[PDB]
Design a protein around this ligand. Structure first.
Ligand SMILES: [Mg+2]
Lengths: 123, 119, 209, 56, 114
RNA sequence: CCCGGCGAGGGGAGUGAAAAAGAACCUGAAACCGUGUACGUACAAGCAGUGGGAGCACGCUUAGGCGUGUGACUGCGUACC
RNA sequence: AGGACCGAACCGACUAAUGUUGAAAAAUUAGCGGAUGACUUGUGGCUGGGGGUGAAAGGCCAAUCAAACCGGGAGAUAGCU
RNA sequence: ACACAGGUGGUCAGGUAGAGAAUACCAAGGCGCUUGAGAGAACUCGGGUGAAGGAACUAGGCAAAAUGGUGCCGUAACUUC
RNA sequence: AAUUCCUUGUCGGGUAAGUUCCGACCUGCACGAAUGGCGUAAUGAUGGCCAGGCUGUCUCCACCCGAGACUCAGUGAAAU
RNA sequence: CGAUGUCGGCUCAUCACAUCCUGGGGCUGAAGUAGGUCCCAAGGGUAUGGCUGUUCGCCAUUUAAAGUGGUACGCGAGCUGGGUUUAGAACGUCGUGAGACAGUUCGGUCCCUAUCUGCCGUGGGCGCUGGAGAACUGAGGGGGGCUGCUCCUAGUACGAGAGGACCGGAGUGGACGCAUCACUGGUGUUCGGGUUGUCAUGCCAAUGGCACUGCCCGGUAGCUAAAUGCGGAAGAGAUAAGUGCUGAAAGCAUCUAAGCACGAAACUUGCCCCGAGAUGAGUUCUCCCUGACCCUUUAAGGGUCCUGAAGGAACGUUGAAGACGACGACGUUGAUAGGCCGGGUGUGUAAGCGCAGCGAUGCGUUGAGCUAACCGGUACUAAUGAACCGUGAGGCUUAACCU
């Protein structure tokens, strides 16, 4: 459950450390955002030399939420980090190639098959 | 709303509510019958009748219980020595409610609450 | 097609074999006993008046039981009437089991909602509160403006204002039937039916086909 | 926040049209002491449903 | 009630191992993909248990990839398959909310033995 | 003298020309508020009247005829300075 | 040592809410500042209205101040309502 | 103007915690603040708690939240040192 | 510029976005040297801008505790 | 001018159509895709922030779109007081000056308990022509009406390729609204634990009081969203724009004049809800009352005694019902409430004793002790014998049967 003006975590080797969402996507007035979702974010913090840079504006996918997501048995999988993974603005696919930390089955798709392939642990 | 709830506020906060029913039960058991309001009547049903049910076992632990409830050894005495063995067979219903009309100075609906085995 | 009489036994969840927790609501459907069959000749409309259950015999009245006695059937806990669909006939003394719903998939639960008392407008009509700070005096949950300056200079019919919310006839539609326990006269349906536990309910089939 | 006319005293009766009191319907007779009292209340003499419920 | 619990008792799983909070446990859950019902493990520390019969549940916390993964497990769910107490634990409080963040040194729980 | 709290206040009883002179006391207007009678009044829109007028009630009476009170219905009609 | 520091009393009155037919003709509540000094306070004393006094703001001079209050001219005057 | 949350000068200084006339609980001592009795809608007053988010709110981080003790370690720009 | 009309001047900073601020630029409508000028540590319930912390400020409110509101009894205004 | 407060915001709006998305056409300098334009169509929908008091605008990034106006530039007896617009103060500027500047800057009291209309609720009266109790009927009125994306058809029609459809279908969203607490949570100052200071219980032990619930950690019921069910229709009818059919007037032609069709989120419906104060008070079913008499102004009249039904009301216990009313359930025959019993729940191994240990403490007894609203029971208490109300067969006029 991520709204805008929320700091997140960069869960890969894309180069950034601290980002913040500026736009929930996928429909007008969509208030909050969960996993498997595409959001337009800034970059507040990147490494001294990386693939990305401070202040860059691009899309990302959310992979870990503090609030957690549910399963059809009723079970919920909560994390301790509102953490996300960058994407391309246009080809809509990630930048880094080393996923940091575990992910969910709600990420897997034909869309993010690449990422879960690079994932260290899939819940 | 107050759906499926319980308890009565009595226009008092809980520290007043708790310290009152301490002195209300301590007064009652001392005389087995007092005069009070019908609202204060029906809730003291839910106070002393478990204390009577507590009086059906005199453990020295339960000697500590009622003094923790009341801070009055005399009532702790009187429950266990007398009221315990008195009401020792009754499956609840240790009291009786006598709505006795209205109070003079304010039109308040008074009641008499007594014990069953009082005579 | 006719509906049947239920009662909100309570909400629960059914696990499937496959790890899917379906929240259903337990509703019992007793022997729904037909009482009066309204017609075209006397009444102009085909409808069966039914009952189910029973009540205290010292509480049923002489006008009431004589209606049952004319039917020659046990006094229920209440009377209900369903408009008969055509080609669907019944006798007077017939009772009806839950097994009519053995073939449905979606049904409609008709029930009196819970009673929420005198609701506030923000609660009743999903309004916005005003600011709780930045200078607001005494207007933290008021609805603010209600009309206009003088040219339609009144308040209009059907204005969203405060009042009783709930305690009334609502009907959630298209609810999936899950299990028809004809053995102990029960019914499992996915969803959250109106009203509180033990309130009586009306289960018709789905109105949207 | 105040009247722009004066209300008629005819309205004042109509305002007080529902403000009437209500007398007691019947009085419960004590079956033993004979006297009357409120239904579901004790007598003025400590009797209720016949018996001496309280020596006052 | 008398009828509600009749439908709950016919769905509770009989193979439930009893334990306490603070007990390091393993859970084997089902994972289906394509037709591959693989039985994926999960393992960590019970921080809380919710006891409501058929609706009973609990919560297992682990520290995976340096991150605190919490999955609340419904007890009688069919999709969990095995619960295995790998280690009991000597806690006092009934629910371990402070162990959502007490990590490293203060992540330690001493093992119950009575 | 009776009610009442030994009250308050009243009711007798007496006084006096008179107490509808009783001391909150000549006379008691209006506003205001009663209580009773009459008639009207619970599908009906507006300075509240007026004009017409059903009925009821009611007085003379010769209940004819009318007075009186009420105003069913209806025409007309937007206070005053 | 200090128109030194923190901080009670004390002395303020900064912010916000309340209150606004108020508990109150200016206050309460919560925080606020100063708090050995150009401090604060008791008891007196003095300065009088075109005058006083004023770390000045027309500020203050008995709930009154760009000219205090009271009495007198005085039934000021009013091409106005 | 009130049996009015205001104002009013001096004196007296128990115990425990506590640097303290801070507080916090008490003693001595004095009270329970002149309508109650219920009910436990909205709304308002005063409060407490809050998933995820963390100022985006807004004129404005107003208000709230938060910080806060002692001992020790440590401490920039600049400085009129 | 507490002074700049034009004017959201231009450039730079900052922000994703900055009619604000900050630093330049001087084209100073209509700076200016004791009605001082330009600086300045310290100071400030001083103005504006930025961050961290912080959180019902907001998203989007939800619940509960008291005080009223409401019922009854006694009392019993107001302005218009 | 004996007072009609205005900028902007906020909270609530509502209307128009001169239509932004959506819907339907026509033409194209419309291959398709994408458009252009005009017509029909107002049912629904129709951003957030940076900036500045703003409005506006600029910008960032969304949407399917980010319609335009009317409403005292809607909306202060609803809010805000930033802008404007009091007194304080300063600069620029002007004036000798006092002063002033649609020059700027700093600071700068937002009263109103609702009589009426109104509106949302909820009642009482009376009526509906014997009384009563239910079932309704459904006049009318209200709710509701959004859309994305993905896939299929199919990389097909089209197209040189690039690109890429119609139509038809599916799946999933967003936004909204309803139901709701099974789940996820929150709350849960009535349950349990922890802990500080102090006071008290003769004292220890053990408690309690007070310290924002003293400070915490938890947490039942309920209430709750962020939790999760469902909704938006399909269909019908008449249509708008528009497309036609046959076809004269007018030997042709012509959608029109006769006749016939098609045609849109608009309309009527169809869905939900209200609903006989629908005075036009409707319908159905049930139940109850079958006395004596006088009186005169005979009258749809006055009274007396007899009778008091169905039932209703009142009373009590009460509710997931509730401001109060109203509504529901129960009142001994009885589970209505309380207690009780069993449970469950949460809390987390009580106290007491034993043990170890100088002791703090730890271990044993011990998932102990306890447990709010809960589950199942239990009449143990409180739900009284009454009494009350409401009566005694129900006007006239026809007709239509039957006598
Ligand atoms: Mg009244």
């Amino acid at each position: 459950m991520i709204q805008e003006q929320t700091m997140l975590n960069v869960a890969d080797n894309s180069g950034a450390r601290r980002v913040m969402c500026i736009k929930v996507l996928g429909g007008s007035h969509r208030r909050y955002a969960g996993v498997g979702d595409i959001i337009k974010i800034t970059i507040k913090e990147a490494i001294p030399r990386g693939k990305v840079k401070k202040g860059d504006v691009l899309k990302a996918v959310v992979v870990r939420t503090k609030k957690g997501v549910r399963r059809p048995d009723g079970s919920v999988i909560r994390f301790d980090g509102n953490a996300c993974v960058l994407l391309n603005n246009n080809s809509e696919q990630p930048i880094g190639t080393r996923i940091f930390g575990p992910v969910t089955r709600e990420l897997r798709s034909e869309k993010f098959m690449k990422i879960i392939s690079l994932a260290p642990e899939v819940l | 709303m107050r759906h499926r709830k319980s308890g009565r506020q009595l226009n008092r906060n809980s520290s007043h509510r708790q310290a009152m029913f301490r002195n209300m039960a301590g007064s009652l058991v001392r005389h087995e019958i007092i005069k009070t309001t019908l609202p204060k009547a029906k809730e003291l049903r839910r106070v002393v009748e478990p204390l009577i049910t507590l009086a059906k076992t005199d453990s020295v632990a339960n000697r500590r219980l009622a003094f923790a409830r009341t801070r009055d050894n005399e009532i702790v005495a009187k429950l266990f020595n007398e009221l315990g063995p008195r009401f020792a067979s009754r499956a609840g219903g240790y009291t009786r409610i006598l709505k006795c009309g209205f109070r003079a100075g304010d039109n308040a609906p008074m009641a008499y609450i007594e014990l069953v085995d009082r005579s | 097609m006719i509906g049947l009489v239920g009662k909100k036994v309570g909400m629960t969840r059914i696990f499937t074999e496959d790890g899917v927790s379906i929240p259903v609501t337990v509703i019992e459907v007793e022997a729904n006993r037909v009482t009066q069959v309204k017609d075209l000749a006397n009444d102009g409309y085909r409808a069966i008046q039914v009952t189910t259950g029973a009540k205290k015999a010292n509480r049923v009245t002489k006008p009431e039981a004589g209606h049952f006695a004319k039917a020659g059937v046990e006094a229920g806990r209440g009377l209900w009437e369903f408009r008969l669909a055509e080609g669907e006939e019944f006798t007077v003394g017939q009772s009806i089991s839950v097994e009519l719903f053995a073939d449905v998939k979606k049904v409609d639960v008709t029930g009196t909602s819970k009673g929420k008392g005198f609701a506030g407008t923000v609660k009743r009509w999903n309004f916005r509160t005003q600011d709780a700070t930045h200078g607001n005096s005494l207007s933290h949950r008021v609805p603010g403006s209600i009309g206009q300056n003088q040219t339609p200079g009144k308040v209009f019919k059907g204005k969203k204002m405060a009042g009783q919310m709930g305690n009334e006839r609502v009907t959630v539609q298209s609810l999936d039937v899950v299990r028809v326990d004809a053995e102990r006269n029960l019914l499992l349906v996915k969803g959250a039916v109106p009203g509180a536990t033990g309130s009586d309910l009306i289960v018709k089939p789905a109105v949207k086909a | 926040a105040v009247q722009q006319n004066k209300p008629t005293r005819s309205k004042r009766g109509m305002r007080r049209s529902h403000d009437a009191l209500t007398a007691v319907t019947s009085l419960s007779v004590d079956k033993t002491s004979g006297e009357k009292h409120l239904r579901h209340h004790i007598t003025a003499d400590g009797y209720y449903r016949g018996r001496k419920v309280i020596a006052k | 009630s008398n009828i509600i619990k009749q439908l709950e008792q016919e769905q509770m799983k009989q193979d439930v191992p009893s334990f306490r909070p603070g007990d390091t446990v393993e859970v084997k859950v089902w994972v289906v993909e394509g037709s591959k019902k693989r039985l994926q493990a999960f393992e960590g520390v019970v921080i809380a248990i919710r006891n409501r019969g058929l609706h009973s549940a609990f919560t297992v916390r682990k520290i995976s990839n340096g991150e605190g993964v919490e999955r609340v497990f419904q007890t009688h769910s069919p999709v969990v398959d095995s619960i295995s107490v790998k280690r009991r634990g000597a806690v006092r409080k009934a629910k371990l909310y402070y162990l959502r963040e007490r990590t490293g040194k203060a992540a330690r729980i001493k093992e119950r033995l009575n």
